[PDB]
């Protein structure tokens, strides 16, 4: 998923 990819960066 797109959103999950960015949220991994934030976390």
């Amino acid at each position, epitope marked *: 998923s797109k959103r999950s990819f960015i949220e991994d960066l*934030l976390f």
Partner: antibody
Amino acid sequence: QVQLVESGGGVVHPGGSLRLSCAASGFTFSDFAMNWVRQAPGEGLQWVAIISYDGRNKHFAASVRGRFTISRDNSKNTMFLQMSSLRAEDTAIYYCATLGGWFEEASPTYWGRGTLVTVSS
Amino acid sequence: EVVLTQSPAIVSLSPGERATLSCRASQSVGSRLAWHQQKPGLAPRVLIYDASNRATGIPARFSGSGSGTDFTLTISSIEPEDSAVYYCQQRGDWPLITFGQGTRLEIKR
């Protein structure tokens, strides 16, 4: 209407374990990251934990890290906070909440009713 | 990481006057700051989001301002019903949410 209802509060012996659940309704649960926030008997808000919309990203404040685990089920619109090795500082009212997300346009902020946890022999 | 400090600790004011509550961040958080209201005995309720925008059902006497490190919440026509504790909360570090210690508004009579 949107509603967040916490359950599982109670007295728990020091060093013991307790499992808190948050039931969501009225909004697309699976779209929101979910937080836990706690409040000591006369003190202010203290952020505790966050669980991502999908559930593979978790974070915990340092004071509860290694003792708390977090889970969510998007088919029941429920989330669970599993507390262990509980001590006096964990005595609080516990809220579940969405706190704005990470988008440029902030996502809505919902607050639960809250549940009381007392750590006492 | 982003510490929020709130001033004053307590503010006592007569109805109809204007309150100004301050929230300073240890590092820039842009406009990603929100204000919550808690009347003790009840759960919190979001008041301002994105540092200046009102939330659902919030009357127009409430107003937020600022960006970066300094932020203010302004209440213009204080009502007795505004007797409450106000918290600021940043989302700039979105995996790491933080709250300010709180500011209490007592209504003079």
